[PDB]
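so i finally got all the pieces together for this one. its four components total, 1008 residues if u count the protein bits. some of the lines might not be protein, just check the labels. i wanna see the whole assembly predicted at once instead of chain by chain like last time, that was a mess tbh
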Amino acid sequence: MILLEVNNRIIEETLALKFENAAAGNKPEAVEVTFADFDGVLYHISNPNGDKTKVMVSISLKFYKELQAHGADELLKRVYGSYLVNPESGYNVSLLYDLENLPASKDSIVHQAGMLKRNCFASVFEKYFQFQEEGKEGENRAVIHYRDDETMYVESKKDRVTVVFSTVFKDDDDVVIGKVFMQEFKEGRRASHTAPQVLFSHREPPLELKDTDAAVGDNIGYITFVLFPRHTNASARDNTINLIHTFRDYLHYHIKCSKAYIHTRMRAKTSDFLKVLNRAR
Amino acid sequence: YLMKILTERGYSFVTTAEREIVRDIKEKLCYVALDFENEMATAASSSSLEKSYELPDGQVITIGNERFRCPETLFQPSFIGMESAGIHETTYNSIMKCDIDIRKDLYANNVMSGGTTMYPGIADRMQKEITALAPSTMKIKIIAPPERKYSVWIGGSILASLSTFQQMWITKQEYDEAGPSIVHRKCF
Amino acid sequence: TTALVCDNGSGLVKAGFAGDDAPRAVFPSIVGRPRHQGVMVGMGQKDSYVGDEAQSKRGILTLKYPIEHGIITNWDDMEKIWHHTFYNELRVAPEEHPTLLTEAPLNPKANREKMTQIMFETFNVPAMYVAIQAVLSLYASGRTTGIVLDSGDGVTHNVPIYEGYALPHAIMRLDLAGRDLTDYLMKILTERGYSFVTTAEREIVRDIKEKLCYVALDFENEMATAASSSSLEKSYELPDGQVITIGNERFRCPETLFQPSFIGMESAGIHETTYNSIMKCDIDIRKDLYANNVMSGGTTMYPGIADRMQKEITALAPSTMKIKIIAPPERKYSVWIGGSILASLSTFQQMWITKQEYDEAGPSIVHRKCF
Amino acid sequence: MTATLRPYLSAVRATLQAALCLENFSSQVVERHNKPEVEVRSSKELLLQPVTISRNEKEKVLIEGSINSVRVSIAVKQADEIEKILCHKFMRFMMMRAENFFILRRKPVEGYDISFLITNFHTEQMYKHKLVDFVIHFMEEIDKEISEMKLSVNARARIVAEEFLKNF
């Protein structure tokens, strides 16, 4: 078992408890929070407004400057501007769950409000969706530096919605996988007979945005990700965005999960030589 | 030769009933390459030069630049290893056998017909290649109208009006009469 | 000292060195892995028994030879067998010695990268190149020019050569192997009333067949004869102390080469199908070709088939010209020895990709945008 | 087979027959507590030669011997980071298990790739030449195991999309 959710285990259970407590009219204890996720998050939570009956989540990231530039705000004004809230300072924005901001069916928002991370990403990805749907090339690319030993942009074409990448290789023991196994994706999908385009590129970013073979014969992953409308329908879409909002970060964690694992073989092996070593007798 | 080619896609799929699909998507989607070595160079940098369709249960196949790769054998019977003049060369063998007495009449009378002339890429490339061998000012206006495909029937539906031909007909009399071994200088 | 020459293919492995008189590194190009709860758990066994050991244990094992979109697809199961070569057949590193690899006609795109990825990052050879196996045969014959048959355990191909210039449109590659025969052949055991008929007996079926089969001389004469005789029926031991005595099947099922149509399969029969090479060939040569008909494989060692296929071919052919049909003793075994001996023409090496070329761009130095 | 390995390790075991020397003395000028005698060698004439022995051009052995205790170190052709650091995930793993077998000069010593500390105690502890007839050859087998980890690790490279993408 290795799976995740966009709403957080840590948060949902505690604040649904705070809202079980709000329904009961209960008195506080001292919460404040800051932490991190994939995508470089500074989460926060609090007892805002000082008093016995409020909670506020807040969040901050540098490249918000590259993102507030885009009309993400309107879907979010629906899904979360259903709730009554204001930005905190130091954070880009914040959700005040004042315990008088809570509804009759207190549960119903909890999942949604927790899943907000990817959902903010989706709230702007929809524009490249709309550009593809309006038949539009090159439109209004979201160049973001979420990371910077890496690169990305979102863009559109009439057939197909798009994202593009960069990421600098550190070690050849990584590269020897990188320049092989995605070429058994870019040439291998029969047993996984679904995927959109993903091109991991050991040197090659696409041409309207950067240009191809921009690495050391293999030392920068200019990955790229492009959608067939069997994804760009109003459905197959969502499944896939979820994967992507973790993918390589989560993957590079799975690396180490598997690094650890081999030591089963190695435990067995090294123990075997400890057996074998007796046989000199 | 395209079905020989499609071994590239490597499933062991191999007969007429499938070929009747291959031919489908060929007759839908093939087009004559306009600048083919640079189209290959483009495929190797923008991937957008492959294309795909769903086969009948859900099984999409992506198929490549084949779509216009294979649409260059016309100039290049040499692809099919072949002694044949390219399309334009073959044409220019006839234009050579023609005359500067008529070469504007040739370069003007660019009249198309049939399913074959219905392809994309082709009259574009060939206007270019014809013009690339022609004199200047030659009106390389390829007379390639919608449903040149059916000009055959349409021309008959028009010219059936000139019913005079119906008397240039071999009558059932002449036929029944014939002693028909004689006919091969009426026919040839 | 050495440079490395192999039947890396189907059937048995049949490898040796450059220049030898014989392949020697020899066992099935198929392997097994225990199909079982190891009830005596901790009895000190590794997870596979390999070709000859697979057979020594075949009641124990799961085994592989994958989809007829190739011969195999997880070739990374010969993964194991690469070591089974390097050590368990040899105790040597490929990384030491220049290597003669081989591959077939018309392999779908990805082959040669995915291969060479291993062959140099893993097998680390000094330098190498990859051959196609047809003319290896003519080297042993001391020839260059004629029609070469392969039918085998991987595959079939039908190959016109002229000191080179071999025909891209009249060479005829085909999926066919002795591999395939058994699916019809073994349904007959319920005609035989044998309430006892499995997967692992396919090897005994193949055995009895390799011991006693032949191809019928004029099949309705044979059918009338089977309808009137049983000297046909010939005895065969089975592993508990049984015998079975069987033997009309022994040439009945050996009609299917002319009758793929037996499974309702729309394929023409063998020589008729093959003639189309020649039909697509030059027409002038078709005189001279009567003396140039070269035929070989393990699948080619049966009785009766020779005269049959000649007369069958002759039902297609004019008379008019001087025949030679050309099928040596040990033709089955022979091909590796001709390809072994090529390396003596040291010229054969100069083609070699070295590991440098493979490193620098990648095997993007040579793969399959390359022709 | 790599058959000059036979000349090689037959000559190793001819050296380890010429010179199966190691036997004890304690003291005559300084204390009785028998030392890492190969480390603390003061002077030549009492003791075995210091030596080194190529297999080829990268590969070689060091052996060095007090009359009672000995070093070995051994050098390997391999030189990629993908050869080294990956097997050194193991050569890290290795060294506490050296504490479970007591005769390593417990480091993956460079110029070579390893070293050993050997002594007369062992000659009195259990057995005779089956010992060195194990050791010298076991030492090859634990190299042939690198081929074992090779396909293992390369198949961990074959973990890759075989998880992440093959989820779909």
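The two ends of chain C are 32 Å apart (CA to CA).
DSSP finds twelve helices and 16 strands in chain C.
anyway lmk what u think
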